[PDB]
C-alpha cells in the first residue's frame, strides 16, 4: 500500500501559489559584488560546511562576517542564496549583505551583517526563567516568519542561533540545510543534527514539513529548563530513537508508525523493546526546579510528540500561556 501521505497544517500551499521565480533557485541569477571591499581579520570557525571569517567593509568602516562556501554543488549554493534573499528583512533572520566571487579560484563567498560571535550554545545553559521565555519567543518569531514564506530551516540547534545578550537581540543563522516546502514532496531524511532529529527522520518518513523545526525547538527547550545538554544523547541515529522512546514511551511510537503506515527499519526491533512514558516532572531536580513550571511542561509536552501533525505550529506556540508575561511586556 505504501506509507500514508501527509501535509502541513499551516502554510501548506504558499509556494504552490507563489510565482515560479520564488522557489526556482536553480534558475536564480547571482548578482556578484566586489570582493575587494572586504578585508578578512580573524577566523571564527571551521568544519566541513564552510570557513567563517570576520572581516571589515573598508567602504564604510563596518564589521562584517564572511562565509567561504565549499566546492559543493552549485544547485545547493543557489538554494541557500535564494532562501536568504526571500527572507531578507524578516524578524531575527540573518541579513545577507553581499555575495562576492574570488577573482582567481572563482569561489563564492557570502557577506552578512556583523553578529557577535556568541551562539546560543555558549549561553542557553546559564539563563534565567524570564530569559528562556524571551529568547524562545524570539526564536519562534524567526521560525513563524520563514514557515509563512514556505521555507523550513531543518537545522534548528543552539549552534545555529547567534545571540547578543547585552542588547537582547537574536539572529537565526546557517540556512545551508533550508529547503522550500511543497506538498507531497519526499525530502532527504539526513538533515539536522543528531541530537535534534525528529522521529520522522529517524523512521525515514520523507514527507515531513515545518513541524520538523518544532521538534528541534522542543529539544532546545528541554535542554534549558532541565539543565541537561543534550536532552536526547544518542550514540548514533538508531540509538537516538531509542533515547527518545525511553522518555516518550514506545506505545505512541508504534501507534505513530501504524497511523502513517511507516515501514520501520527491522534493526530497530532488536534495540527498542517496551518503554513506558516518563512524566516530565521526573526530570526535575534541585538544580533546575526554578526553571520548570506547569506552563513550561505543558508547552514542552505539546512540542515533543511523535506525530508531526500533533505538534504545535510556530504560530500556535506563541499564543501559549508560557509566553503571557513576555507578550504583555512588549
Amino acid at each position: 500500500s505504501g506509507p500514508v501521505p501527509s501535509r502541513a497544517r499551516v502554510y501548506t500551499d504558499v509556494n504552490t501559489h507563489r510565482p515560479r521565480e520564488y522557489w526556482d533557485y536553480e534558475s536564480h541569477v547571482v548578482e556578484w559584488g566586489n570582493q575587494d571591499d572586504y578585508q578578512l581579520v580573524r577566523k571564527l570557525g571551521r568544519g566541513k560546511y564552510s570557513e567563517v571569517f570576520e572581516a571589515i567593509n573598508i567602504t564604510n568602516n563596518e564589521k562584517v562576517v564572511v562565509k567561504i562556501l565549499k566546492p559543493v554543488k552549485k544547485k545547493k549554493i543557489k538554494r541557500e542564496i535564494k532562501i536568504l534573499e526571500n527572507l531578507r528583512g524578516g524578524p531575527n533572520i540573518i541579513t545577507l549583505a553581499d555575495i562576492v566571487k574570488d577573482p582567481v579560484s572563482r569561489t563564492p563567498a557570502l557577506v552578512f551583517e556583523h553578529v557577535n560571535n556568541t551562539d546560543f550554545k555558549q549561553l542557553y545553559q546559564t539563563l534565567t526563567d524570564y530569559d528562556i521565555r524571551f529568547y524562545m519567543y524570539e526564536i519562534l518569531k524567526a521560525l513563524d516568519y520563514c514557515h509563512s514564506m514556505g521555507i523550513m530551516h531543518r537545522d534548528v540547534k543552539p549552534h545555529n542561533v547567534m545571540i547578543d545578550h547585552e542588547h537582547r537581540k537574536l539572529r537565526l543563522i546557517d540556512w545551508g540545510l533550508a529547503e522550500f516546502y511543497h506538498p507531497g514532496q519526499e525530502y532527504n531524511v539526513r538533515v539536522a543534527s543528531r541530537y535534534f532529529k525528529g522521529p520522522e527522520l529517524l523512521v525515514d518518513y520523507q514527507m515531513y514539513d515545518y513541524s520538523l523545526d518544532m521538534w528541534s525547538l522542543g529539544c532546545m527547550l528541554a535542554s534549558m529548563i532541565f539543565r541537561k545538554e543534550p536532552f536526547f544523547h544518542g550514540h548514533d541515529n538508531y540509538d537516538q530513537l531509542v533515547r527518545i522512546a525511553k522518555v516518550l514511551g514506545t506505545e505512541d511510537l508504534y501507534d505513530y508508525i501504524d497511523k502513517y503506515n511507516i515501514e520501520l527499519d527491522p534493526r530497530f526491533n532488536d534495540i527498542l523493546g517496551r518503554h513506558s512514558r516518563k512524566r516530565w516532572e521526573r526530570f526535575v531536580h534541585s538544580e533546575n526546579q526554578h526553571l520548570v513550571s506547569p506552563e513550561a511542561l505543558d508547552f514542552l509536552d505539546k512540542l515533543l510528540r511523535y506525530d508531526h501533525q500533533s505538534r504545535l505550529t510556530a504560530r500556535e506556540a506563541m499564543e501559549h500561556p508560557y509566553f503571557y508575561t513576555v507578550v504583555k511586556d512588549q
Binding site: 575587494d36 571591499d37 572586504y38 578585508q39 578578512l40 571569517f53 572581516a55 564572511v66 562576492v100
Partner: peptide
C-alpha cells in the same frame, strides 16, 4: 593580505 591585501 585576504578580498583586500
Amino acid at each position: 593580505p585576504a578580498x583586500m591585501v
